[PDB]
Every structure is written in structure tokens, then in C-alpha cells.
Symmetry: C2
Subunit: 563 residues, 2 copies
């Protein structure tokens, strides 16, 4: 309808101009091909000229080569534009996609948004370009064919050129009728498919009550309804083209009957009627396809509207102002109420968890209460509804978001690795500011240089997708070195199962826990020997604060520590 | 390929034969159309015999009417086969689909299986039937047009007929080239899209670890690769058509060159060469689809293979022989080793849990420790790996699953309904064996009389989806009535909500009490009132019975009763 992706086309318009020129010249090539007929039939195969037949094979092969060359060039130079705007659209949408908060990736999954990166973006320039190609080529072919009509036979030129828009209208209303009946009937077909959907929704409560025999009879009736619906749908679909063919055949018969009159006859040669008839037959495909121009132009821009709404949404709120260099001081929580997104149930009560500087605070929960939820707030993934976290004696909403996530470091076994090299991965987003020797020695105090050696190249190898495939413990052995290099003010550690690295990876996490000896540690781990070693322990459950003290002090009302 | 759908299509053969005759007539409704050209020019616009031009409009309009009528009749009569071979496939893949264990409905989704009901089965009748509407029409049009050429010109028909398979082979090899390069470049493009997916996947990592400028640079250099890849794919797809057009145009020029190479040529009238060249270009469309038909026949049979493997799998192991009536003997778990299917972690240890007859046995599993998974053993939703459930003093393996599951009435607030009437829903699968008065009073002792009377037509009211739409507890109020109509020796009671929204009903729990007046009732619940009422209590966590006793006795040791 009304699209403002044209600025993204605005510098890339030379490709459009070249494609349009090549396409109108393709239409002219088709016109000249059809123009070839009259000398062949009138001069060539009528009067035995014998030179016409000599030089026509050459020009027809030349014109077919001209059709081929111009079609290939037009397709290449329109897909150049459809690639150079899809690339720009992908770049912009990707930027605003990584801009937006984590809630956007949730409730949508990482598979759909990829389709909105490649599927929707392709349709943006595979239905608009697919509309421009038609409206130019087959829209100017009609003009060329009517110029043929004016040139070679003016007598019936008037009759078919006045008749043609009426035929276009006929095809338009027939297509509209087909579209309407198909739409309403397709809604009905879905409305009966939901019956099968419900029937297969419970395979339970059919085996229990023992109703297999009854549950096929009803499905037999539903299948019969579906069959009748499908037969009516095909009838409606395959009556459309026949009636169109009949109304256009009335035009063909009208032209031929008009030719009966003496005045139009005897001025037109045997070849002239030939070219006008064959051209009229050729007119059907452009005349039919021009009507569906708006259809395809509203199947590419329609998806583009959804893509724009994805683009035009709001990035995460960044009213923060105070960049914090290093948050070594105490971190305090203050009457913070958080609600998980998409749910009215708050997963967090009014929580006051205070993290002492350089100390350990450990959360032990197997219920899935939200130990990860509280881990989210300190990194400001999901924001805070009411209350405040005095981060080194200052609110998060005062702190800039980039600075805040520069302070914190989240270590886990679900760590994702980019398609980079190992050296650029350890010093991620700061490899310019961190040296190679720093990365190496950081890996060394992170006691993780072993597997780094054991692959092909070592200090400069790829850590890419479908490449080395480090185990979860080994990926965490990269992750600990990341925060070790970065000198994170806060190191909120997670944990999962480990075998043959419980001896290693955890006692190496002593080396990250040397940064616990140097910095705070909001450890989220759920089972380890270090859990009892943890200085301060909280056992927060169902989003509720439960108990505060060391494990021996915590053993009082404790009934879950046993594991 | 090798398909045994023909047993399914055999009774629907007359429709197929009529469709074949109709498509043959449709193809012959092009050869006569082109046949009328010769007198229209040779006897018409050449030697001016007006009478030929007088009758020509009538015959062309009649022939187009014949084309339309026969095409519509063929489309109908190839939908009475495509509407009754898809129907039998749907029905026969329905009985053997709902007879399979619920592990099918795990490891899968209802939407996917519905797609295997509607879309996948529609391909079987729209690609394997699309290989019959196409091959017999466009294979008959070829024969008709060659017979035309032979009739009107014995001389250049031989040059066109031997030449035609060469052009067909050219089309086939070009299509194979396109297919190969397209599949390869599309696989590489997929290899790029998984990179895009991984960068989208680690959203949290890019947010937390630092800036996103390097991430945008990465996506710039991956979108450049995507754009170049797409341009090359389009280059292949575009250059497919011109080379075909050229290798056919050289045949066109060959025909025209041979149209005067010997002196015996040029004995053909203008109308005749017109007919032959119109039929030559006509040949392109059938000859460009007869080669492509095998792809459609292997795109409909391929999905039929998916349907066949879904159908041909196995239903429950039905080795039991005896039918217990009312299970007055106690149900009893004895040294049963069960594991959640799809996982190696055993959700059940070796559990010995006798259920005293006519006695309530409640269990509290708010840890999420597969309490519902214990509700599945007696119903045999997931089969027991090893060990015997000592049913009624005997083993359940000796009992028929259809009969055994009738001896269990599973009652839950997530109960599934149908598109039937509320009476039959009260007596589902057994409405013939239970009268309307029995249903009426059964609902009354269930305290379901009030609402079902407040609906449209009392007990005659339809309970269909998007109809009356009883609420959750109100939906429970029907399942309980289903259980009161006997068919309920054993009552594994779900009670998932335990949410007294409007105090529930005053007699929801009282209706269950009337249900639990006698009979084994292995109660699943979170309602502390029912646990207080419960006689035997087995609290379960992490797939093991931690305790057995009564309310105070079990309160004394451990206890999550604090909730
Ligand atoms: C006045 C204004 C208003 C009044 C109007 C009233 C009208 C009166 C009614 C009468 C006419 C109505 C038509 C009718 O009544 O019936 C038609 C029946 C045809 C004959 C019956 C009646 C004719 C006589 C009537 C009068 C009798 C007195 C329709 C039909 O036959 O079938 C229809 C058919 N049309 C023809 O066949 C006529 C065909 C052929 C007809 C020939 C006979 C006609 C003339 C006879 C008389 C001549 C003198 C009078 O050519 C034409 O059109 C016109 C050709 C004439 C011009 C030159 C003739 C040569 C003779 C010269 C004198 C001797 C149509 O073809 C498709 C087009 O494709 C190429 O384009 P490309 O460029 O490749 O991209 C061709 N390029 C070409 O051919 C170019 C030529 O090769 C060049 C030749 C190459 C060398 C020659 C080879 C020979 C060698 C072989 C020997 C081995 C086109 O040709 C064109 O237009 C271009 C045109 O040729 C250019 C002219 C060049 C010709 C050269 C001149 C001669 C040279 C000689 C020397 C000088 C060709 O038309 O496909 C439809 C459906 O197919 C669909 C499908 O099923 O969905 C639809 C499309 O897909 C779409 C969609 O749109 O929905 C879009 C896709 O993107 C995709 O999304 C897809 C999706 O996947 C889902 O589907 O959906 C499509 O794509 C296709 C595709 O294949 C898919 O796979 O699939 C069919 O419908 P359906 O079957 O009914 O359902």
C-alpha cells in the first residue's frame, strides 16, 4: 500500500533503472518476434520470395538471443537491488533485534526471529521485486502489442483495443469471486479441521473411557464433511479459469466475425490476420498476470509491515546516567518487587538480599523457584517494577546499562561461543584493549590452557560453529577466563553436573573464586562441596526469602540441604 | 516409486477413468482449435471464401465451450477420487493413530499430527493426482499435435518429431543442472543461516559481555555472504530459462531453414505452415511439464511415505486375555522399575505402594516429582518396563487394556470434551447401555444439575467446543458425573487446580466425597483439606516414597506440610 522502504532503495536505484530498461526491451523483443510473422506468411511463404525464408532464421535466432541476454541481465540487475536492500534491511533489523530486551527473544523463540531475518526479509524483495518484474515486463508488453495493433492492422485495432479493458475487468471480477468464495470456505475448512484437532488433542480420555469405536464414527462424519468441502473448493477453483477462457473466446470469435465484413477484409493480407490473431493469443498471459500485480505487491509489503513493526518496537530502556568504573563496594537490595513477564504471579517478593564486598552469597534451590530470576535482575535482563538495588550505594536506574553489565559477569554451563577465533573470544568486544599475552596468561591462571593446546593451532585457532565443540565444562573453562581477564567487579556464578572435571573445573573455579576472594560472588550453584564452603547461604524458595546464615547455622529449619 | 495406494484407490476407479477421458478430450480441444487455422487462412483470408470465416466463430466458440466443460468435469471427477482416496487415507491413518501409545503425543505435538491429517494427506491427493491431470493431458497434447503435423505435412513433421525428444532431453539436463547447483547453494545458504541463528541465540551473552559493535560487524560480513549466495542462486535459476529457450529456438530456426532447403519444400500453403508453427510453440508448454511430472509424482508419494510410516507403526501390546469387572481387590505396586520415556533418569524407583480397598490414598507431590507420572501406571498410558502391578490379586499384563482402562476413571480439571451432546458426554462410549434417567440422576448426585439446566436445552444441550464452554471446575463437574455412572472401580483423582475460585461449588469436594464413598481412590491433590480427610498419606519427592502414614504421624518426621 504505502511503504517507506524506498529510502533503502533510494541509493540503489540504478539497478532498478537498468532492470526496467532491460525488461521493456524484452517486451519489445517479444513484439518484434511476433512482428516477424507477416513477411514470413505474406511475403515469404505466400509469394515464393525465397530470400525472406533465407534471412528470417537468422533474425529469429538473434532476437531469441536478445530475449535471453536481456532476461538474464534484468534478473541479475533486479536481484542486485533485491540483495542490496535485503542486506540493508537485515542489518537494520538485526541491530534493532540485538538492541531489544531479553523479553523479546522469549515468548517468540530463536527460531521464529531467524525466519523474520531470512524468510520475511526475502519476501520483502521476492514479492515486491516479483511484482515490479511483472508490472514492468507484462505491463509494457501490452503497450507494445497495442502499438503492433495500431501499426499492422488499424481496422480491427480499434475493436480489440476497446474490447481488451472489458476482458481485463471480466478477469478481475472472476478472480475476486474466486478469492471471496475460497476465503470463506477456507475459514469453514479450518473450522472443521479444529474438530480433528480436538479429537487428537485427547488421546487421553479416550483410552480411559474406552471409546475408540465411537471416536472413529464421528471422525468418519468429519472426514465426509471435509471431503464435500474439498470437492466444492476445487469446483470453485476450476470453474474460474474456464469461464475466463470462455469470455476471452467470445472476444476471439468477435474479432474473427468482425473480420467477415468486406471493408476490414481485402485490406488485410493472409499474414496480417495471422499476426493479429497470434498476438491476441499472446495477450492473455500479460493481461491475466497484470491483475495479480496488487496481489503480490500486498504479499511482500504485507509481510514487510510485520517486519517494520518488529523493527519499530522499543529497545530496552536506558535512562541510566552514571557510568560506574568498578563496583567493589557493597551491593544492597531495597524493597524490590519483580514480576516475571507474561505472568500476573510475581516470582519475586519484596526482597532485601545484601551482597557484602569480597564475600560469598550462595543460593541453593532445586525447585526452580527463581534463583535464575534473581540472577536476572542484577544483570538488568528483566527490569525492576518497583524498588531499587543500591549498586555500590547507587540505583541501577541511575547507572548506565552498558556500564552495569560491564561490572557483572555471568558464568554458566550454557555459555554460547561465537564463530570467532579463540584469542578474540576471550577478550570479547575488548580485544583491542587486551593483549595476547594477557589472554594467554589469563587462561593459564584459569588453568584452562590444556585443551587450548590440545587442538590444532592453539593460541589462534578457530572456536567456531561445528568446530572444536568443547564440552560444557570446557566451555565454562573458557567462560571463567573471560571474567578473569575482564576483572569483573561482580561474578555471579552458575553451575551444572560435572564428571572428571569436578576434581578439575571446580577446583579451577577456585581461581575464579580467587576473584570471589577479591570481589563479590552471587553464586547460584545447586550442588557442590563448595556449597557448604560458601560463607553466607540463602535458600530462597517459591520467590520467598528463607533463612540467612552459614550452613551449620542454616541447618535449623533446613530440610532441603540434605541431597 | 512403488506405491500400494492402489488398494485404497481401487473402488474409486470409474472416476479416474472418466477423468482420463476428460483430459484426453481437453488435449484434443487444443488440436482442433489449431486445426481450424488452415481453412481460416488457406480457404479464408487467402482465397476469399466468406463462408469459412462465417462458420469459424461458431466452431471456435463451441470448441472452447468443449474445453471448458471437459476441463471442469475432469477437475470435478479427479476430486471425487482425490476427495475419496484422501478420505480413506485420513480415516485409516486415524484409527491406527489414536490406537498408538500416548508416547506418540509426547515426542510430538497435536499441531504436527493434525498437519499429518490435513496437509500431508492433501499432498497425496494433490501431487500424485497432479501427476495424473498433467501426464495424461500434456502427454496427450503432444501426441495430438504430432498427429496434426503428420496430417498437414508429412515432410517437415519428420524433422520436428525426431528433433522434439532432443529438445526434451536438453530441458531435462538443464533442469538437472539447475537442481544440483540450487540444492548445493541452498545447503550452503543454510550453513550461513545457522550462523545467523547462533548469533541470535546467545542474546544474553552479547548483552552482558560488552558492546555489540563487533556483533554488528559480524552480521555485516555474514549478510554479505548471504547476499552473494542469493545472487548466485538467482543467477543459476534465471539462466536456466534462456538456455532452454535458445536450444528450442535453434530448433525453430532449423524448421524454418528446412522450410526452403530443398525445392520440394514451399509446397505447403500459408495456413499449413501457420498451423505447424503454432503447434510448434504450443509443444513447448507440454514438453516443459512432462519432464517435470516425475518431481511432482515423487513429491506426493514422498509424503505418502511419511503417512505410511506413521500408519505402519505399532499400537499397544495387547497380550492380556481376561476381563476383570469391578476391581474390588486392592491395586498394588510391587518392585516396578519405571522410567519416563525419552529420558534415562528413572522417575520411579522400586516402589511398593499398596492401596487399601475402599480407602483413600492421597499423595502430595508439589515438588513436581512426577506425581502425574504415578497416575499413568495404572492407566497404562506409559507401559511398565519390568515388574508387575498386582491388580486385584493378579497381574495387569494378563488383562486386556481396553477392559482394564474401563476399570479406571481418570477425573481431572483439565478434562477433555467432545463435539457431542452433554448426555453422551456423561455416558461417552456407553450411551447405548445407559438411559437418560440414569444420566440425569448421575449428574444430580454430582451436583451438576444446576448449570446443565441453566444452559440452552437442559440435558439435550450440546457440549461442543466454542459452545457452552464450561469452566475448569465446571468441566470437572461433568467428569465426576461420568465416574458416578459406575465405570469407576479405581479413581486416580487429579484435582490439578485446588483453586476455590467461587468456593468452587459448595459440593465439588462433596461430590467427590460421594464419588469416594467407597472404591479405591489414589488421590492426586494439593488441597490440604483433602489431605486431612485422606486416610493413608504417601508423600513423594524425587521419584521415591519418603514417608507413609497419616496427617500427624507423617507431620512428625520431615514434612512439606508447612505449605
Ligand atoms: C483483445 C484483448 C482481450 C481479448 C482476449 C481474448 C482471448 C481469446 C482466447 C484464445 C487465447 C486464450 C488462450 C487459450 O485459449 O488457451 C491457451 C491455449 C494455447 C493454444 C490454444 C488456443 C490458440 C488458438 C486460439 C485462436 C485460434 C484461431 C492457453 C494454454 O495453452 O495454457 C496456458 C499457457 N499459455 C500457452 O501455453 C500459450 C503459449 C503457446 C501457444 C501456442 C499456440 C498459440 C497460437 C496458435 C494460433 C497462432 C496463429 C493464430 O504461448 C502463449 O502464451 C501465446 C502464444 C501465441 C504467440 C505466438 C504463437 C506462435 C504462432 C505464431 C503464428 C504461427 C501458460 O503458459 C505460461 C507461459 O510461460 C512461458 O513464459 P516465460 O517467458 O518462459 O517466463 C511461456 N513463454 C514462451 O512460450 C516463449 C516461447 O516459448 C518462445 C518459443 C521458443 C521456441 C519455440 C519452441 C518450439 C520448438 C519446440 C519443438 C521441439 C509463455 O508463452 C508466452 O506467453 C510468450 C509467447 O510465447 C511469446 C511468443 C513467442 C512465440 C514465437 C512466435 C512463433 C515463432 C514461429 C516462427 C515465426 C507461456 O504462456 O500457462 C498457463 C498455466 O500454467 C501455469 C500454471 O499451471 O500455474 C501458470 C504460470 O505459473 C504461475 C501463475 O501465473 O499462476 C506463475 C509462476 O511464476 C509460478 O508462481 C506458478 C506457481 O508455481 C503455481 O502454479 O504459477 C506459468 O508460469 C506456468 C509455468 O510453467 C509454471 O510451471 O504454470 C496455461 O493455462 P491453462 O492450461 O488453461 O490452465
Amino acid at each position: 500500500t504505502f511503504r517507506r522502504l524506498w529510502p533503502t532503495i533510494a541509493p540503489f536505484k540504478a539497478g532498478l533503472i537498468v532492470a526496467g530498461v532491460a525488461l521493456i526491451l524484452n517486451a519489445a523483443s517479444d513484439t518484434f518476434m511476433l512482428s516477424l510473422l507477416k513477411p514470413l506468411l505474406d511475403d515469404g511463404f505466400g509469394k515464393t520470395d525465397r530470400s525472406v525464408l533465407v534471412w528470417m532464421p537468422l533474425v529469429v535466432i538473434g532476437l531469441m538471443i536478445l530475449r535471453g541476454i536481456t532476461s538474464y541481465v534484468s534478473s541479475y540487475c533486479i536481484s542486485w537491488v533485491s540483495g542490496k536492500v535485503v542486506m540493508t534491511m537485515r542489518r537494520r533489523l538485526f541491530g534493532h533485534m540485538m538492541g531489544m530486551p531479553v523479553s523479546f527473544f522469549d515468548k517468540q523463540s530463536t527460531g521464529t526471529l531467524l525466519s523474520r531475518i531470512t524468510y520475511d526479509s526475502e519476501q520483502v524483495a521476492s514479492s515486491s521485486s516479483g511484482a515490479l518484474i511483472t508490472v514492468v515486463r507484462e505491463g509494457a508488453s501490452i503497450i507494445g502489442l497495442f502499438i503492433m495493433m495500431f501499426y499492422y492492422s488499424w481496422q480491427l485495432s480499434i475493436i480489440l483495443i476497446v474490447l481488451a479493458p472489458i476482458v481485463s475487468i471480466a478477469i478481475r471480477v472472476v478472480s475476486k469471486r474466486f478469492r471471496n468464495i475460497s476465503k470463506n470456505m477456507q475459514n469453514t475448512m479450518g473450522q472443521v479441521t479444529t474438530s480433528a484437532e480436538q479429537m487428537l488433542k485427547g488421546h487421553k480420555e479416550v483410552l480411559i473411557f474406552g471409546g475408540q469405536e465411537v471416536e472413529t464414527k464421528r471422525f468418519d462424519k468429519v472426514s465426509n464433511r471435509m471431503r464435500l468441502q474439498g470437492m466444492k473448493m476445487v469446483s470453485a477453483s476450476s470453474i474460474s479459469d474456464p469461464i475466463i477462457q470462455l469470455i476471452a473466446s467470445l472476444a476471439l470469435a468477435f474479432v474473427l466475425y468482425a473480420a467477415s465484413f468486406p471493408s476490414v477484409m481485402d485490406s488485410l493480407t493472409a499474414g496480417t490476420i495471422t499476426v493479429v490473431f497470434s498476438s491476441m493469443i499472446a495477450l492473455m498471459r500479460p493481461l491475466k498476470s497484470l491483475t495479480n500485480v496488487n496481489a503480490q505487491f500486498q504479499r511482500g509489503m504485507a509481510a514487510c509491515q510485520t517486519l517494520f513493526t518488529i523493527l519499530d518496537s522499543e529497545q530496552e530502556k536506558d535512562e541510566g546516567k552514571r557510568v560506574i568504573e568498578r563496583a567493589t563496594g557493597d551491593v544492597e537490595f531495597r524493597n524490590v518487587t519483580f514480576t516475571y513477564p507474561g505472568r500476573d504471579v510475581p516470582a519475586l517478593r519484596n526482597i532485601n538480599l545484601k551482597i557484602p564486598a569480597g564475600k560469598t552469597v550462595a543460593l541453593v534451590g532445586r525447585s526452580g523457584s527463581g534463583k535464575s530470576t534473581i540472577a536476572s535482575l542484577i544483570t538488568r535482563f528483566y527490569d525492576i517494577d518497583e524498588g531499587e538495588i543500591l549498586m555500590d550505594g547507587h540505583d541501577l536506574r541511575e547507572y548506565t546499562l552498558a556500564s552495569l553489565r560491564n561490572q557483572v559477569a555471568l558464568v554458566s554451563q550454557n555459555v554460547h561461543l561465537f564463530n570467532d577465533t579463540v584469542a578474540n573470544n576471550i577478550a570479547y568486544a575488548r580485544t583491542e584493549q587486551y593483549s595476547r599475552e594477557q589472554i594467554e596468561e589469563a587462561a593459564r591462571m584459569a588453568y584452562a590452557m590444556d585443551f587450548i593446546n590440545k587442538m590444532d593451532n592453539g593460541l589462534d585457532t578457530v572456536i567456531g560453529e561445528n568446530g572444536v565443540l568443547l564440552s560444557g565444562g570446557q566451555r565454562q573453562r573458557i567462560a571463567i577466563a573471560r571474567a578473569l581477564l575482564r576483572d569483573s567487579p561482580i561474578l555471579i556464578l552458575d553451575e551444572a553436573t560435572s564428571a572428571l572435571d569436578t576434581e578439575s573445573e571446580r577446583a579451577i573455579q577456585a581461581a575464579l573464586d580467587e576473584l570471589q576472594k577479591n570481589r563479590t560472588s552471587l553464586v547460584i550453584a545447586h550442588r557442590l562441596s563448595t556449597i557448604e564452603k560458601a560463607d553466607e547461604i540463602v535458600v530462597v524458595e517459591d520467590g520467598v526469602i528463607v533463612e540467612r546464615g552459614t550452613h551449620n547455622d542454616l541447618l535449623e529449619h533446613r530440610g532441603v540441604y540434605a541431597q
